[PDB]
Amino acid sequence: ELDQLRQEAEQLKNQIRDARKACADATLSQITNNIDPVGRIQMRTRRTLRGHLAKIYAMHWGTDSRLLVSASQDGKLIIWDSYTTNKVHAIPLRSSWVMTCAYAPSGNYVACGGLDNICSIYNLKTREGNVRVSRELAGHTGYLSCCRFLDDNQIVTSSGDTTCALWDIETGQQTTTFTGHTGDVMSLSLAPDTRLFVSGACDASAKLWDVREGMCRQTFTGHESDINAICFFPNGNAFATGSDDATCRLFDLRADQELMTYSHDNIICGITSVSFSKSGRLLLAGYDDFNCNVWDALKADRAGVLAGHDNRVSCLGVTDDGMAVATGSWDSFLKIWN
Amino acid sequence: TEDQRNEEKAQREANKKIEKQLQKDKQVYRATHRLLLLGADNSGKSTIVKQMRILSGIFETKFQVDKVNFHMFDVGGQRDERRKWIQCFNDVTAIIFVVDSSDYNRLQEALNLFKSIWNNRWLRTISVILFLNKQDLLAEKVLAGKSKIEDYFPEFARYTTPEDATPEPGEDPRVTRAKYFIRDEFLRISTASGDGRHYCYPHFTCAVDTENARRIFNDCKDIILQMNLREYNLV
Amino acid sequence: QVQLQESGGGLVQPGGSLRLSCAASGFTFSNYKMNWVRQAPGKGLEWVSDISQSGASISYTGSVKGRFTISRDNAKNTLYLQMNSLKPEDTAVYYCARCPAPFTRDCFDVTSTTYAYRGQGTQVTV
Amino acid sequence: TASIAQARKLVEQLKMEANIDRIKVSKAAADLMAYCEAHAKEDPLLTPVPASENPFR
Amino acid sequence: GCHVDSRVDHLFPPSLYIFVIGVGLPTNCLALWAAYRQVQQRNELGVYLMNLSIADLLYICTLPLWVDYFLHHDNWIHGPGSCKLFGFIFYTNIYISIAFLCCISVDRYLAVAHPLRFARLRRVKTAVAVSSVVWATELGANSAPLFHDELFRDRYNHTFCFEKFPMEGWVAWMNLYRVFVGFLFPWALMLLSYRGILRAVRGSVSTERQEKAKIKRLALSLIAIVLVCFAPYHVLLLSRSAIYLGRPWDCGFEERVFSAYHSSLAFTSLNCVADPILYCLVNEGARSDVAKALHNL
């Protein structure tokens, strides 16, 4: 029985490999062998947002391209105003070990989580006039890696216990649980239509999930170590992965196959964060050697370098109109580049 | 304009209030020392926590020595894999490593864990305070026992007690020889790498003892002394 | 897809000889440290021996210090373990394990209950 | 038995994932390139914006 | 008073002063640059260092006119107010430098002997307040001779500035106060601080014998060089004050010490060259920062 199961599994794996081999038709470089190089990209620091005490672990942009939220290991959550570098709110946290933060699209709620395995929601528009805790969500058996808002009443969470979950904030209950990874899940990103989402784990694999039914449709491999960043292309038909083997890759969902790999001989350090631009031509990544690289996705040749951080870069973000790039690092500073 | 200037002045007053609060919080924050506790299940790592009378899955203890506040953490609500959440503890003052020296069939795993911690990229500038617990059990095991440290370590038949060792008032020389052999095993891999950027402090402890917080306090004083020697151009 | 498969093993008598050969695929073979682990009936996972990238530093556990010898073959992407004087205490399942990260001198999780880059194993009986 | 059930679940997952409709890589590359060229005029990061509209100047 | 004469006068002080200015100005430039780098990183020590550097620069700005005085060649320099200001600066910068050295030593002691206390006394604001108090107090205490006659054309053939052979009682008391509260008090504190630092280092279990000795050599050098540079002139000042407070009419003593009272009031201006290298350049990190700055250009 067990031997039959193993033989059957190997046979279906062979059939899947043959189908993928047949479906492959050409290379991305051959189709992209006529476009012009993007040109040298030069960016400078425009604002230096200072005020934190310890290393910054995450950040998120509000849906106005003006407001911002930052999370630090000192145990604070500061809401900035990028235009005037003015602090709006400073929320203390019960647990200092925070690993993620989010900003609701409406702008009335802010969520956070970390090593306490609990997701906390805070309200920004209160009649009394202070930010106060609104709801604590519990049920995960491992540290929280990422959390994203769908609506004002739903949220998606990923844990280090190899699971993802969908919540209902009003009643504080779980509606669907997604399982199937072997290692810890490190990041997730929602589709533009908020109906599918992808997640990368520490087993050198990524998976696509459908929010409603609660099943896995596609699984992607190709890396040789942990994946620690993921993001969605601005059209919802591809995504990008950064791993601990000092490489980046691009995956597509309608071909179920890897498309392009960015790497260099000198680079021997991993990738911590990955984000795209508005058009989909620039890929921004941060590395353990204290700097960020700007790759041209179509040509896969490095075209920009962002330097100025004195320690490891941990978080990267881009506005919803494409007017700024925010980078945080372990030197307790946040920098805006244009 | 009118409303623009009004909202701007309200914004600056709010910003200055927040900045004052942040200055106070920094004042409070920069005067507390953080420590990370590590060990195994058989080791009595929580036992020393309760031995110190002060005493979600994260156990936090606050104690105080000579008007200096220490905050210790124990992460015990996760899975076995720990190569991802340990990177959070990179700015910690020290790592307290507890070792079960009474048993032998699991000493090699403690050696491997210590060596893995020692050679990390984000933990190569953090000092480790080593506590070899369960000395009293070791005394009984070595004295009248059938198990031999020769079988697990075939290099124990050629090692003599170093001169600098200071025996206890009354103690079998064989007990001292073996108990210092374990320490030499742990210190051999701790001095074969590094450029004097971090040190290892060993101590012998039992299941009922009191002067442990003072040991950690003295080690923290030495660590800060080294950092200040580097900082104040006095090297 | 990272893949590692063991081969060899079998049945022997006390005081015998064996050669366990581990084949690998899916990654560059000369940037990673390699280890040998085994688990016996009624026991948990335990560590035996390890070898570095080039093949200079070699580490053993004491109980097999004078008997077994490790080797790596970068050209053929293979790992080898050589057996000698098999005392009736080695009957187990043997896994060849990879360090999680390249260009790295420490292996954190190799003996975990669940680990991604670990083989299926082969059974040796003495 | 529990491991047998887990393996049976794994085989069922592979069976469910082994019958998805697929298209060629060239089509996907063409779509991505076309999208990239379609929205090239509205990316300030790639195309510098006049200094009279940049809010961080 | 009486025709004291010398031959070394027109021989050493000039060349020694040229050496001092030429090999001291750029070094204090580098010292100021490194102190600014230090204070940028929220390190209080640099503040003190910065102030020290500034003092030395002032000394150089008042040195060239003075080598005119010892050469007896004017080139339209002489005048009452010019000397009234430049002699004041010339005679106060030494004591300001000694005070800042004492401040640096005490700050170093507070950070090695007691690394977990006095968190309030080791902030930049406290440092700047202490520095301002030091400057104001030094200027106020040393402005005593600014409200007195300075230029004295004597007989024989001279026009000394800020000194008179049959000096009055006010000069004697001023000189006495300026050798028992301007040299020996701020040096004793330095010696005690470095003794304490060495004692603390001896008991450090995390320091090898290599590094635990380079420290003893450096501290001993820093203690000894100040004495070597400053002791003879203050010894002679004490002797002259004692002679005047005893038999006042005596001139022979002055007659046989003038040939070198100056050689001392000249040797003494070598701490300005000593301090920048000993406090910035010898250290490998600061020298490496200097080399990096030079490569950056």
Numbering used by the authors:
A (entry chain B): 3 to 340
B (entry chain A): 9 to 63, 205 to 384
C (entry chain N): 1 to 126
D (entry chain C): 6 to 62
E (entry chain R): 8 to 304
Show the paper's wording.
Among the over 800 known human G protein-coupled receptors (GPCRs), three specific receptors — GPR4, GPR65 (T-cell death-associated gene 8 or TDAG8), and GPR68 (ovarian cancer G protein-coupled receptor 1 or OGR1) — were identified as proton (H+ ion) sensors regulating signaling within acidic microenvironments. The three proton-sensing GPCRs exhibit different responses to extracellular pH variations, and each receptor has distinct preferences for G protein-mediated signal transduction. GPR4, in particular, is responsive to protons and engages with various G proteins, playing critical roles in angiogenesis, endothelial cell inflammation, and cancer cell metastasis suppression.
To elucidate the G protein coupling versatility of GPR4, we determined the structures of chimeric miniGs/q-coupled GPR4 activated at pH 7.5 (pH7.5GPR4–Gq) and pH 6.8 (pH6.8GPR4–Gq), and miniG13/iN-coupled GPR4 activated at pH 6.8 (pH6.8GPR4–G13). Notably, two distinct groups of cryo-EM particles were obtained from one batch of pH7.5GPR4–Gq samples, and the resolved structures were named pH7.5GPR4–Gq-state-1 and pH7.5GPR4–Gq-state-2, respectively. Comparative analysis on the two structures reveals significant differences in the conformation of extracellular domain, especially ECL2. In pH7.5GPR4–Gq-state-1 structure, ECL2 adopts a typical β-sheet hairpin configuration observed in Gs- (pH 6.0, 6.8 and 7.5) or G13-coupled active GPR4; however, in pH7.5GPR4–Gq-state-2, ECL2 resembles that in the pH8.0GPR4–Gs structure, which is packed more horizontally into the 7TM bundle core accompanied by the varied conformations of ECL1, ECL3 and the extracellular ends of TMs 2, 4–7. However, the pH7.5GPR4–Gq-state-1 structure is more similar to the fully active pH6.8GPR4–Gq or pH6.8GPR4–Gs structure, including the extracellular conformation, indicating that it is in an active state. However, in the pH7.5GPR4–Gq-state-1 structure, ECL1 shows an outward shift, possibly due to the different modulation at the initial activation stage between Gs and Gq coupling. Most of the proton-sensing framework in the pH6.8GPR4–Gs structure is retained in the pH7.5GPR4–Gq-state-1 complex, including the critical proton-sensing interactions involving H2697.36 and D161.31. Furthermore, additional long tube-like densities were observed in the cavity formed by TMs 3–5 in the Gq-coupled GPR4 structures, suggesting potential lipid binding.
